[model samples]
Target: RDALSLEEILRLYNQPINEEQAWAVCYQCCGSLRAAARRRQPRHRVRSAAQIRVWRDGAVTLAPAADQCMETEVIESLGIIIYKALDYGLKENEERELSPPLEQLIDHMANTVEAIRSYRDVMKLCAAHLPTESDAPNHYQAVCRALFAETMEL
Candidate 1:
């Protein structure tokens, strides 16, 4: 089974904030992270670290205060589904191997990753430069749902 659920993935993906508390601030105060800052709570994590990208429509999407499109430089799973598969292999098995079916999973995951990137890019291409850098990992998790979870007959 996959490590994350479809619902869980949706909430995380396309969201600039990574932590639950950060989301709570957005959920409680406003749908956007920028809106959270206007409240001036004891601490404003969402607004404190969110990036700004406003369209002429007066809508806002959160981004990393500063970051790249994808964190390809990093060599860890962090939140990517591929990392979880690798982690499962090493920690749970003596040979640290994944079979043919498992191998194919990696292949599909490659596509899945691209899907989110493409989705994000498409969103921007349409003129909504948003979600946020912090949220990519989350969105990726959500995207992974299709790799295996969606076709689960096992």
Candidate 2:
């Protein structure tokens, strides 16, 4: 599969997301990384150099340590969702001359956050149930694919 560039990934996210927002999304999305690593022996060594590079680029261009990842796929998936939400909100705002009330927009953002949190919780639960040395990459991919699928169904 082709690796997604930052620009392309950002485009997938529908709203305007600044650096700080991006970091927040990453942190929230991959909160299970530390626990997941601690459960394994000797820790899981970084798997993909390309994933690391994209993370580093996000960090360097945005803020210090912004791209660091204990779980690369999870974080990257979060970034994509964050960007997509931002893009969607922005497009929605542009469609109508009158903007939604600030409270409504805030409610929308909060709802998205909550939904993502629930999804992460489910993924972490599934990860915990899997056997040792299970295909972590495949698990992460499945979780992310599920997220996008759910969003499309909405």
Candidate 3:
């Protein structure tokens, strides 16, 4: 019998075998396709708030003000997630040596809060700068109105 090539191996494992066949195969082999597909995809990269704003406009073409608000919320949320994860890990183990740096975590949380506050100020400024009525309808203005409504909920 001939040995399978890489492509053949991928096809054999990933070609969506029936439930009965999947059960017969080992978990590692049956799940190889999903693992390989995930590996082929680009990993998500976390960006600084400024970098996120630029990418949102350049890549996604979000209006500048909306991008700024979105980037602000996203980065702040990421920071919070990280902080919470650390807090949870620290809380899990009673040993002080296993705990994260309390002072650093507090400082990081404080900085994140400040950035969020500043972003809110920028959003208000942007809304104030928008024209009350334009000769032509602006998509950016529509987005701004939508954002205003959403932000108020927060």
Candidate 4:
């Protein structure tokens, strides 16, 4: 009963972006963070950033401007999710000491925010050197979905 539904989580986040895309972004971030949490490793040392890894018919690469815009918006969407979660926790229970579950949620959400940001940074760098129009269409969202599917195979 305590867990949030997918729709509620999106609504609570309340950002101006495609809900489906935002969900994918959140899913990808969660996947990475979940994997990272299992193995005891320094946060910075984890090489969990997103990559295009395009196989031929061509080379893999960064998203175009449109894709970049989607990426940026998706990152903000996750940020808002974390903010709303914290705001809700504090507003609902300001008078009492933090519950262990709430504390755990905030801690995990913070890590999620960082994970999303790390992905954004890597995508930013990839977009920098890439030509505005790469020969093949770069499906940034698809890459995330594929990556998560691969991650789940673990």
Candidate 5:
């Protein structure tokens, strides 16, 4: 083994892994996550954003998208903040304070109702502005896909 050169090791290195190969590995790990979640784990890939702890090529990623109904999105976001604040104890007060008071009155600014940004997390088109051969498109798309992939138990 001492006689081996750096060039020898480099030449024997495995081929560059493509997307599908990476996904299979991630999918396998997701199966393990499901075992941890049990009933809830098998039922929903993701009901909230906080449920996901993501990784890209083994590097931890923080921006996994949310995949719940529109209304649930609101509660999910506030809930994560509140939950973490409570998790940290000292930070709980700050996070809990962020949530609107249960009794807080909502005066209608207008009789008409409208909303923006649907429950889906396909917020922007990353590919159009990027070079056609670049990884930007793939990278952004993967961020959205991880939403369900992280929780796919069954």
Candidate 6:
């Protein structure tokens, strides 16, 4: 199989996606990564690269910790990207709609966060809405929710 670049993966989700749809995407991602890991010829050692910090005020942040995992790296990178959409969406003040770029990235996030209504609309505009195929099975349930919440705040 061909390797999928981050840009290609981002584009793959270039559609409106809601909570449900985000979960769908998460499952697919999880499945694909799991498969890829299994296909590698040599096994890799687990390393602790960085830690996710949540302050007392409930604010979240990440800092370089000398070590990171592939799944965690991907999750954090994507989460930061999606959060920008929320920031842009809020700052624009154009109610009922978000900035186009924000919307575009936001849409891809589920199909691939914090702005509740925008998140809802993001899902609303999605091109796909059905549960389809992925190698992920029942175990993906927990991780999917984790991915969803990680990308999302609440």
lDDT scores in order = 0.30, 0.36, 0.28, 0.36, 0.29, 0.36
lDDT of candidate 1?
A: 0.30
lDDT per residue for candidate 5 within 57-138, as digits (tens), equals 3222222334433333432342333233223324324423322321120101111233223212111221222345255435
| Cand. 6 Cα-lDDT | 0.36
Clashes of each: 3, 9, 0, 1, 1, 10
What's model 1's TM-score?
A: 0.19
**Rank ordering of all candidates by TM-score, starting from the highest:** 6, 2, 4, 5, 3, 1
lDDT of 6 by residue, 8-108 (tens): 32334443333432333433443444555566522222222122322222222233334324444444344444343233324455433554544554445
Query: For model 4, how does the per-residue alpha-carbon lDDT over 54-120 read when each residue is reduced to its tens digit?
Result: 2222222222222223333434444445335334434454533344533333334345423334443
**Candidate 1 lDDT by residue in tens digits, 1-154:** 3233222333344222223222222221223432443563222122222222322222334443332222221111112333242343243445334455333323332443332232222222222212464553334334332322432422
TM-score (all chains, Cα) for each model:
0.19, 0.25, 0.20, 0.24, 0.22, 0.30
**Model 1, position 106: C-alpha lDDT score:** 35
Clashing pairs in 6: 13-108, 13-111, 16-126, 17-123, 18-123, 49-67, 49-68, 50-67, 108-112, 109-112
Residue lDDT tens for model 2, 6-45: 3444446543444333333333234434454556522222
Residue-level error in angstroms, candidate 4, position 138: 19
Once model 6 is optimally superposed onto the true structure by TM-score, how far is the C-alpha of residue 23 displaced, in angstroms? 1.4
lDDT of 1 at 24: 24
- The better candidate by lDDT, 4 or 6, is 6
Whichever of 2 and 4 has more TM-score, that candidate is 2
Model 5 clashing residue pairs (backbone): 85-92
Question: What is the per-residue lDDT of model 3 for residues 19-101, given as tens digits with 9 covering 90 to 100?
Answer: 21111111112122234335553222223212211111111111122222233343244344333322332445552221233
Worst 10 residues of 6 by lDDT: 42-51
